[PDB]
Amino acid sequence: MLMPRRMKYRKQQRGRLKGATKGGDYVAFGDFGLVALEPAWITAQQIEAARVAMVRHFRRGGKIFIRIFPDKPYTKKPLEVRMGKGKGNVEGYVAVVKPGRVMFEVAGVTEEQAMEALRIAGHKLPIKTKIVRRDAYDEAQ
Amino acid sequence: RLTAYERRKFRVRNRIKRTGRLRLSVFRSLKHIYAQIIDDEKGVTLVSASSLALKLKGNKTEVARQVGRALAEKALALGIKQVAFDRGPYKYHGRVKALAEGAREGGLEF
Amino acid sequence: PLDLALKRKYYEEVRPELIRRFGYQNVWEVPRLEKVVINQGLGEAKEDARILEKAAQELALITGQKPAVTRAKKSISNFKLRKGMPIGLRVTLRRDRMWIFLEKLLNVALPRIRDFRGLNPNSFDGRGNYNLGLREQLIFPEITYDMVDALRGMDIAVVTTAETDEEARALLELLGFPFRK
Amino acid sequence: AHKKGLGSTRNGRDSQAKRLGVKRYEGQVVRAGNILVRQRGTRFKPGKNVGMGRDFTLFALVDGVVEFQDRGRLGRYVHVRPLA
Amino acid sequence: ASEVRIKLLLECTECKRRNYATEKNKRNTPNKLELRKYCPWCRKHTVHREVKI
RNA sequence: GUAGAGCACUGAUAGGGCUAGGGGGCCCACCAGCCUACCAAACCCUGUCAAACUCCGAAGGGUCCCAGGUGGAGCCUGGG
RNA sequence: GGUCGCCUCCUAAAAGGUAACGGAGGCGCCCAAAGGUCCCCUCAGGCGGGACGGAAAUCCGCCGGAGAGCGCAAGGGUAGAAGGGGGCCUGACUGCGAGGCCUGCAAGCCGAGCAGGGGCGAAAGCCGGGCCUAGUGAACCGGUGGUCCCGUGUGGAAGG
RNA sequence: UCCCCCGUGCCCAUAGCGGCGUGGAACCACCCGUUCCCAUUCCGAACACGGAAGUGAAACGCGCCAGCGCCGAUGGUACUGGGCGGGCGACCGCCUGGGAGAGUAGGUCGGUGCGGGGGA
RNA sequence: CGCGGGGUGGAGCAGCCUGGUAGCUCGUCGGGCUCAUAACCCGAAGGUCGUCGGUUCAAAUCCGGCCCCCGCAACCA
RNA sequence: CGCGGGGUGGAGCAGCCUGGUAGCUCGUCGGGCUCAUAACCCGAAGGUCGUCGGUUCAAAUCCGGCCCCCGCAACCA
Ligand SMILES: [Mg+2]
Ligand SMILES: [Mg+2]
Ligand SMILES: [Mg+2]
Ligand SMILES: [Mg+2]
Ligand SMILES: [Mg+2]
Ligand SMILES: [Mg+2]
Ligand SMILES: [Mg+2]
Ligand SMILES: [Mg+2]
Ligand SMILES: [Mg+2]
Ligand SMILES: [Mg+2]
Ligand SMILES: [Mg+2]
Ligand SMILES: [Mg+2]
Ligand SMILES: [Mg+2]
Ligand SMILES: [Mg+2]
Ligand SMILES: [Mg+2]
Ligand SMILES: [Mg+2]
Ligand SMILES: [Mg+2]
Ligand SMILES: [Mg+2]
Ligand SMILES: [Mg+2]
Ligand SMILES: [Mg+2]
Ligand SMILES: [Mg+2]
Ligand SMILES: [Mg+2]
Ligand SMILES: [Mg+2]
Ligand SMILES: [Mg+2]
Ligand SMILES: [Mg+2]
Ligand SMILES: [Mg+2]
Ligand SMILES: [Mg+2]
Ligand SMILES: [Mg+2]
Ligand SMILES: [Mg+2]
Ligand SMILES: [Mg+2]
Ligand SMILES: [Mg+2]
Ligand SMILES: [Mg+2]
Ligand SMILES: [Mg+2]
Ligand SMILES: [Mg+2]
Ligand SMILES: [Mg+2]
Ligand SMILES: [Mg+2]
Ligand SMILES: [Mg+2]
Ligand SMILES: [Mg+2]
Ligand SMILES: [Mg+2]
Ligand SMILES: [Mg+2]
Ligand SMILES: [Mg+2]
Ligand SMILES: [Mg+2]
Ligand SMILES: [Mg+2]
Ligand SMILES: [Mg+2]
Ligand SMILES: [Mg+2]
Ligand SMILES: [Mg+2]
Ligand SMILES: [Mg+2]
Ligand SMILES: [Mg+2]
Ligand SMILES: [Mg+2]
Ligand SMILES: [Mg+2]
Ligand SMILES: [Mg+2]
Ligand SMILES: [Mg+2]
Ligand SMILES: [Mg+2]
Ligand SMILES: [Mg+2]
Ligand SMILES: [Mg+2]
Ligand SMILES: [Mg+2]
Ligand SMILES: [Mg+2]
Ligand SMILES: [Mg+2]
Ligand SMILES: [Mg+2]
Ligand SMILES: [Mg+2]
Ligand SMILES: [Mg+2]
Ligand SMILES: [Mg+2]
Ligand SMILES: [Mg+2]
Ligand SMILES: [Mg+2]
Ligand SMILES: [Mg+2]
Ligand SMILES: [Mg+2]
Ligand SMILES: [Mg+2]
Ligand SMILES: [Mg+2]
Ligand SMILES: [Mg+2]
Ligand SMILES: [Mg+2]
Ligand SMILES: [Mg+2]
Ligand SMILES: [Mg+2]
Ligand SMILES: [Mg+2]
Ligand SMILES: [Mg+2]
Ligand SMILES: [Mg+2]
Ligand SMILES: [Mg+2]
Ligand SMILES: [Mg+2]
Ligand SMILES: [Mg+2]
Ligand SMILES: [Mg+2]
Ligand SMILES: [Mg+2]
Ligand SMILES: [Mg+2]
Ligand SMILES: [Mg+2]
Ligand SMILES: [Mg+2]
Ligand SMILES: [Mg+2]
Ligand SMILES: [Mg+2]
Ligand SMILES: [Mg+2]
Ligand SMILES: [Mg+2]
Ligand SMILES: [Mg+2]
Ligand SMILES: [Mg+2]
Ligand SMILES: [Mg+2]
Ligand SMILES: [Mg+2]
Ligand SMILES: [Mg+2]
Ligand SMILES: [Mg+2]
Ligand SMILES: [Mg+2]
Ligand SMILES: [Mg+2]
Ligand SMILES: [Mg+2]
Ligand SMILES: [Mg+2]
Ligand SMILES: [Mg+2]
Ligand SMILES: [Mg+2]
Ligand SMILES: [Mg+2]
Ligand SMILES: [Mg+2]
Ligand SMILES: [Mg+2]
Ligand SMILES: [Mg+2]
Ligand SMILES: [Mg+2]
Ligand SMILES: [Mg+2]
Ligand SMILES: [Mg+2]
Ligand SMILES: [Mg+2]
Ligand SMILES: [Mg+2]
Ligand SMILES: [Mg+2]
Ligand SMILES: [Mg+2]
Ligand SMILES: [Mg+2]
Ligand SMILES: [Mg+2]
Ligand SMILES: [Mg+2]
Ligand SMILES: [Mg+2]
Ligand SMILES: [Mg+2]
Ligand SMILES: [Mg+2]
Ligand SMILES: [Mg+2]
Ligand SMILES: [Mg+2]
Ligand SMILES: [Mg+2]
Ligand SMILES: [Mg+2]
Ligand SMILES: [Mg+2]
Ligand SMILES: [Mg+2]
Ligand SMILES: [Mg+2]
Ligand SMILES: [Mg+2]
Ligand SMILES: [Mg+2]
Ligand SMILES: [Mg+2]
Ligand SMILES: [Mg+2]
Ligand SMILES: [Mg+2]
Ligand SMILES: [Mg+2]
Ligand SMILES: [Mg+2]
Ligand SMILES: [Mg+2]
Ligand SMILES: [Mg+2]
Ligand SMILES: [Mg+2]
Ligand SMILES: [Mg+2]
Ligand SMILES: [Mg+2]
Ligand SMILES: [Mg+2]
Ligand SMILES: [Mg+2]
Ligand SMILES: [Mg+2]
Ligand SMILES: [Mg+2]
Ligand SMILES: [Mg+2]
Ligand SMILES: [Mg+2]
Ligand SMILES: [Mg+2]
Ligand SMILES: [Mg+2]
Ligand SMILES: [Mg+2]
Ligand SMILES: [Mg+2]
Ligand SMILES: [Mg+2]
Ligand SMILES: [Mg+2]
Ligand SMILES: [Mg+2]
Ligand SMILES: [Mg+2]
Ligand SMILES: [Mg+2]
Ligand SMILES: [Mg+2]
Ligand SMILES: [Mg+2]
Ligand SMILES: [Mg+2]
Ligand SMILES: [Mg+2]
Ligand SMILES: [Mg+2]
Ligand SMILES: [Mg+2]
Ligand SMILES: [Mg+2]
Ligand SMILES: [Mg+2]
Ligand SMILES: [Mg+2]
Ligand SMILES: [Mg+2]
Ligand SMILES: [Zn+2]
Structure with missing residues (x-):
């Protein structure tokens, strides 16, 4: 379960999700990666869920990289209560992802192995995804 | 980084420069002493x-x-x-003073 | 300015040895003592008696200079220490008054101490200076036993133009600084 | 029916707006006494014919024309060139 | 102010007028306040002293 | 001083390196040699995040001067 | 239930201004030195060395632009001082106030300069409290000290 | 009117840190001395005064080198004033004008003003 | 703002009217008695009598000011 | 969900207001009395103050969040 160790501020405004990803758009560690096609707040539950799925898939072996981190506090007012009287409470953390952002990477596992594992992972994520291979373009970046 | 030398310099010079008058500057070497008068507006x-x-x-x-x-x-x-x-x-x-005292009765208004 | 013993040994014996040992080109390159600072880090007189002036009269006695106060920079609770409390004495010996203290130290003070077996060699600054600690202070000759209330140490620091410990090691060893190892 | 155990708000205040900023610009004609800059600290420094008040307010000491200057590390200055 | 930081007048010793009003800490500086101050009445300066507000 | 962007500040941050200390075993302890597919401050490299972070920073916006602009423009006083 | 005035920051969309029972914090004091001035000084922190002495007391060395300090919350400012020490001092003045900031009013804010009589400084100069922005309360009614202006036919007195 | 030095401004790191070298005729500095003026919460360190034996070791001036720091295009892109279009919708896209930040190439061991002293 | 009366040893305290004694109880210390406990009994340490100035041979005792705690009554635009 | 109170040696309670200093009763452990147990007498140990942060030279004590316990509230339809 990801979440900041410490926090300058406890509640955080929502914001929009303009544009493509700010950066973190090229593979930087492994051979294959999962890329976001549409933007979302990726929950800490989902990150972890994908993580476990890959781990489980190639039981003992390879290394998983995680290029996204939930630092945004997600708020929710209680059930059946009305508007006003303060902001809701923190109820979890999300990571803001945008198209182009590589979210996971794997390495040291066979090509076929990587493909299935990253594929299953995407199924856990609330967005459309694509797998990619490390390119001359990536190493150039 | 700054010597107390430099800090004093700026500190006393700046104050005078604000009054906008002509400036009687002074150098006091071990062997001589020098005194020039400066228009800091024009820098001359x-x-x-x-x-x-x-x-x-x-x-x-x-x-x-x-x-x-x-x-x-x-x-x-x-x-x-x-x-x-x-x-x-x-x-x-002492020395700087004497320069002032002289320049005073010499006719300078200060 | 004043003819004194140790200054003669430096200028007539220590100097040349140093030159032939490190081959100094210019004259001022030759390492020399700059100053000697004594510091009785008391604070035993913190909230306590202003009878740090007893340690101060004892101090001025040894050095021939009046000692200045040092007071608390920051307050520390664990030490029962209020920022501004008088907690030490410091006196800076330069020129001839330095030379006299060092002469009586190398000759009369340092031997008269309990089980002297040499100064610590490793205690060199790293950029040419040297530091040591006394615990007695009746060890200085001009302090008879009757003048003392309780014992009191002090922090001696000796500062040289020496670029490094080697040069510094030599300047001190040659003056009469007995080293342990 | 509806209005259940809601809550409260441990904060929810602010101070009055203080209308700070530059009040006369480069090239603007000014009377002696005119306020040139309202500020907190010397975000600007007083220059030629410009005095500074106890709250760092910059005002003109002469009738003239306002002029700005960035002297890099020495800060920024507001001047007033007098007019012939 | 407070019970301890109190208000007070400065009275001219020459002609007994009170020409200034200020404050003081009673605990810190417990003595009456002595101060030279301009007197508009006497039109010179004067030692003024504290006087109960 | 925003959008964007950035990590120089205040914090956050994944991996690796390096490395105080902390933990497990060894020597067995008195002090020291510990070696460590563990925990980890500072620091370095890769890679990022922030309304109350900014080494940076547009487009725009504001005001001033000059020029065009004669409009159910504009400005001053007063009645509704 | 919470809140009600004032201050700081964000929300606030790069002038000003801007709402919500939006997100965070403060104030209702304080200082005769924590004020004026003249003169001098420069931090925090790191590493090394140093009796008692430690993570941290005081001393030495090298590094260091400001990450310290500036009574207090935060911001801005700031060592070319607003910070640290000392000397002398009371401008924490009186009578005014060209000109502006702000602004519905009423308030609030900055202010050169003139006269009086002073302070510190050789001098230029600075000084009408405090680095700045909170530390507050219209009018009515009454108290106290002045002044000697009105005071019911006149002089006092009452009262203004 | 070219060169060196001294005082002093301006531009505010392309000027800085660090390294190596050079300079004492002159200037300047360390230097010599504590009688006098002045001074140290102790110390002639600093400030100050009277000097000129020594030295350019330090400091400073002038060079040289690109490890650091600093500066940094063009090209392209983000974003955007204005004008539009596609999609049920999430969001995308077009014209027109403006246009970063990062990074790449690359630059940098300062440049100049006024006076004073000394040179060829 | 105006009155009234206190401060006396570690706690409470009459001494103050009527100027010659810092006294009482409780508290702590030592000793006696005690199944012990208390109570009883002998001794003992412990104070500028709030301050400062003043009348007096001398005053906690009497005056002036001042500090402080309690108390009394009234006012609060 | 709201408002008020509380968590401190094994048990039960003080100390927080006003920052510096940890108390009480019980229990416990060691030694007495007694043939022995208790009652009784002497002497001792025992907490790092719910948990995270923050203020401060310094925090049981002041400030924010969270956890557990306790009391009150929860109405008009
Ligand atoms: Mg973590
Ligand atoms: Mg969106
Ligand atoms: Mg973008
Ligand atoms: Mg976009
Ligand atoms: Mg786009
Ligand atoms: Mg991104
Ligand atoms: Mg494999
Ligand atoms: Mg999916
Ligand atoms: Mg590919
Ligand atoms: Mg490929
Ligand atoms: Mg590469
Ligand atoms: Mg610097
Ligand atoms: Mg200085
Ligand atoms: Mg200074
Ligand atoms: Mg002659
Ligand atoms: Mg110029
Ligand atoms: Mg004469
Ligand atoms: Mg004349
Ligand atoms: Mg001598
Ligand atoms: Mg010799
Ligand atoms: Mg001590
Ligand atoms: Mg309903
Ligand atoms: Mg409720
Ligand atoms: Mg609550
Ligand atoms: Mg505000
Ligand atoms: Mg307003
Ligand atoms: Mg507002
Ligand atoms: Mg001013
Ligand atoms: Mg202002
Ligand atoms: Mg300009
Ligand atoms: Mg400039
Ligand atoms: Mg600068
Ligand atoms: Mg400046
Ligand atoms: Mg500046
Ligand atoms: Mg008189
Ligand atoms: Mg009083
Ligand atoms: Mg008088
Ligand atoms: Mg900016
Ligand atoms: Mg801003
Ligand atoms: Mg910075
Ligand atoms: Mg910051
Ligand atoms: Mg930080
Ligand atoms: Mg960090
Ligand atoms: Mg890491
Ligand atoms: Mg690591
Ligand atoms: Mg270990
Ligand atoms: Mg073991
Ligand atoms: Mg052992
Ligand atoms: Mg053993
Ligand atoms: Mg061991
Ligand atoms: Mg042992
Ligand atoms: Mg043992
Ligand atoms: Mg090993
Ligand atoms: Mg913002
Ligand atoms: Mg922003
Ligand atoms: Mg730039
Ligand atoms: Mg820049
Ligand atoms: Mg800019
Ligand atoms: Mg531009
Ligand atoms: Mg613009
Ligand atoms: Mg026109
Ligand atoms: Mg209410
Ligand atoms: Mg705006
Ligand atoms: Mg004080
Ligand atoms: Mg001084
Ligand atoms: Mg000084
Ligand atoms: Mg230090
Ligand atoms: Mg050390
Ligand atoms: Mg130490
Ligand atoms: Mg000890
Ligand atoms: Mg020191
Ligand atoms: Mg900082
Ligand atoms: Mg500090
Ligand atoms: Mg600063
Ligand atoms: Mg600061
Ligand atoms: Mg500067
Ligand atoms: Mg100062
Ligand atoms: Mg200082
Ligand atoms: Mg200081
Ligand atoms: Mg000071
Ligand atoms: Mg002081
Ligand atoms: Mg002073
Ligand atoms: Mg004087
Ligand atoms: Mg006043
Ligand atoms: Mg006019
Ligand atoms: Mg007029
Ligand atoms: Mg108005
Ligand atoms: Mg106001
Ligand atoms: Mg005057
Ligand atoms: Mg002077
Ligand atoms: Mg004078
Ligand atoms: Mg003033
Ligand atoms: Mg203040
Ligand atoms: Mg204030
Ligand atoms: Mg009010
Ligand atoms: Mg009325
Ligand atoms: Mg009245
Ligand atoms: Mg009236
Ligand atoms: Mg009359
Ligand atoms: Mg009458
Ligand atoms: Mg009458
Ligand atoms: Mg009458
Ligand atoms: Mg009257
Ligand atoms: Mg020529
Ligand atoms: Mg020049
Ligand atoms: Mg230039
Ligand atoms: Mg520079
Ligand atoms: Mg180098
Ligand atoms: Mg080199
Ligand atoms: Mg060489
Ligand atoms: Mg070379
Ligand atoms: Mg050569
Ligand atoms: Mg010569
Ligand atoms: Mg002589
Ligand atoms: Mg003499
Ligand atoms: Mg003399
Ligand atoms: Mg003097
Ligand atoms: Mg003297
Ligand atoms: Mg002293
Ligand atoms: Mg002195
Ligand atoms: Mg050089
Ligand atoms: Mg090189
Ligand atoms: Mg380079
Ligand atoms: Mg720059
Ligand atoms: Mg471009
Ligand atoms: Mg283009
Ligand atoms: Mg566009
Ligand atoms: Mg557009
Ligand atoms: Mg559209
Ligand atoms: Mg449509
Ligand atoms: Mg589309
Ligand atoms: Mg189109
Ligand atoms: Mg079109
Ligand atoms: Mg274009
Ligand atoms: Mg375009
Ligand atoms: Mg070059
Ligand atoms: Mg350079
Ligand atoms: Mg260079
Ligand atoms: Mg060149
Ligand atoms: Mg030219
Ligand atoms: Mg009673
Ligand atoms: Mg209650
Ligand atoms: Mg309550
Ligand atoms: Mg209660
Ligand atoms: Mg509660
Ligand atoms: Mg609680
Ligand atoms: Mg407790
Ligand atoms: Mg309990
Ligand atoms: Mg109870
Ligand atoms: Mg409590
Ligand atoms: Mg309480
Ligand atoms: Mg027993
Ligand atoms: Mg028994
Ligand atoms: Mg703490
Ligand atoms: Mg405590
Ligand atoms: Mg705490
Ligand atoms: Mg607690
Ligand atoms: Mg708590
Ligand atoms: Mg009902
Ligand atoms: Mg009904
Ligand atoms: Zn008068």
């Missing part, structure tokens, strides 16, 4: 007197008094009378 020395240039000698303080007096002569001639005294990094005392 109007008149200057010194020990080296005076080809002067005979005990530092008594010498210093004269270069002041001599400074007033060339100053008053040009029209300068109103002036402010840049005492530099040096305590107003």
